[PDB]
Symmetry: C3
Subunit: 95 residues, 3 copies
Amino acid sequence: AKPANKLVIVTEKILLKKIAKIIDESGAKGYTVMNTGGKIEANIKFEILTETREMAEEIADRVAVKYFNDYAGIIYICSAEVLYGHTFCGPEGCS
Amino acid sequence: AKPANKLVIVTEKILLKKIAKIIDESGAKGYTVMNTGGKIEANIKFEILTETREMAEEIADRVAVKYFNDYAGIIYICSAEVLYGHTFCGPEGCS
Amino acid sequence: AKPANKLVIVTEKILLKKIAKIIDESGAKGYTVMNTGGKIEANIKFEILTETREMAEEIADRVAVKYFNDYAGIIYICSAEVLYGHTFCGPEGCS
């Protein structure tokens, strides 16, 4: 039972590569992405689990500052506990 | 860090327009929708962030009463904090 | 307002049937599944609401032990309250 912060980013489809690049540079182990609708126009949704709150805010602050003046989008955070995940918890395990 | 209520509605694909219409009339700023499976048959999932609990229940109570006697579906709620989002937090920001 | 445990499983696409079969045998009422990306390669995401914590861990422990030595994936849990859902709450309702 390793606690975690689930960061969610919903925004326009064009930024996929731009946001994916930012997530990799933050220190996050991995992420999930999926095609969605919004209002209905096609857009994307990122889901990133992070060990610390600070890392989650670091990802949100950069994406918002860089693109949210021009492009539409929303970013929010949820509490979670990771039970299994080699990259997130390590070979040691989530215990 | 503006607190929010994440309302989730999973139900049959036919109701997309019917449920989308209800969400707009509730006072919710926007929503996300996506194609999913369930048991596997194709169905839809709505995700709505709301400022108050009452608004979330207002959306759930109407959709359930109107369609859940006939159609299959589930509605649940999650705690969240919106970090960035112009429509949800306003030009003032989520602070 | 019936409390629930939202179990989420993200893993490789091949295991869809293998994991779907396990979820059915656990005692979970139903589930949601959807095509997603991850890092970008195509993969799947399961979402299972469960009445007890023990049932959620039972599903996670079996899937992890059986496939997570070979295949990549992450499993985490979120708090939630089910407002409407005939299969989850019964004909009595979520109250």
